[PDB]
Amino acid sequence: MTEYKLVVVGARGVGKSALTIQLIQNHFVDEYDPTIEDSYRKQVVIDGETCLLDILDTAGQEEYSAMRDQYMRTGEGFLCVFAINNTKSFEDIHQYREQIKRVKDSDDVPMVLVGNKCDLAARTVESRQAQDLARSYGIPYIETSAKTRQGVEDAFYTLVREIRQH
């Protein structure tokens, strides 16, 4: 069966891991637990197609430097996550989209911008902003909450449909 290699990337603390365990295991991890690397394989059905989700959950920042090049070379689609109450992580999005284009040797790579933690009142990143950014890349923008589970299947399934269309 068709597998889709996907990698979840973005800055630390934005909820990369909370989105992935809400999808795989259906529950909210409200813990403090920084990732080095976690990989997850889940056999799923999407738009009637049998497929395997081979997800790679990554570390926000650290001595993952050019050392990101390796997963970025092999992931077919990317979730670029920032958090809606963290302006720095939204500004850091640029840096990841450029390194991904730099290793994949292309200007169109399957991607979706994910504005996580949409359940929190007190956001510092408005959606106009994050929509126009998504618009400038020709990339989808979707808001999520790993707490409510609002938007999480939609962000992962949209990205599969982006790999499917490339």
Ligand X SMILES: Nc1nc2c(ncn2[C@@H]2O[C@H](COP(=O)(O)OP(=O)(O)NP(=O)(O)O)[C@@H](O)[C@H]2O)c(=O)[nH]1
Residue numbers of the site for its own copies (CB under 8 A)?
47-49, 84, 115, 118, 126-128, 130-131, 135, 138, 140-143, 151, 153-154, 157-158, 161, 164-165
Please count the residues of the chain.
166
In the bound state, the residue with its beta carbon closest to Mg ion is 35
- Is residue 20 a contact partner of residue 10, using CB atoms and an 8 Å limit? no
Footprint (CB under 6 A) of ligand X, residues 54-83: 59-60
CA gap 51, 70 in Å, rounded: 24
The binder of 143, among Mg ion, its own copies, ligand X, none, by C-beta within 5 to 8 A per type, is its own copies
Whichever of 72 and 139 has its CB closer to its own copies, that residue is 139
Q: Which of 4, 7, 15, 17 binds Mg ion (CB under 5 A)?
A: 17
Question: Based on the number of CB atoms within 10 Å of its own CB, is 99 exposed (0-12), middle (13-18) or buried (19 or more)?
Answer: middle
Q: Which two tokens stand for residue 127?
A: 């959606």
Binding flag, residue 35, Mg ion (CB under 5 A)? yes
Give the nearest distance from C-beta 47 to Mg ion in angstroms. 23
Which residue matches tokens 């007190």?
Answer: 122
CA gap 125, 102 in Å, rounded: 27
Q: How do beta strands 37-46 and 49-58 pair?
A: antiparallel
Q: Can you count the helices (H) and strands (E) in the chain? A: 6, 6
Binding flag, residue 151, ligand X (CB under 6 A)? no
Q: Between 28 and 47, how does the x/- string for binding to ligand X read (CB under 6 A)?
A: -xx-xxxx------------
Binding flag, residue 161, ligand X (CB under 6 A)? no
Side chain identity at residue 158, one-letter code? T
Binding flag, residue 86, ligand X (CB under 6 A)? no
Footprint on this chain of ligand X (rule: CB under 6 A): 12-18, 29-30, 32-35, 59-60, 116-117, 119-120, 145-147
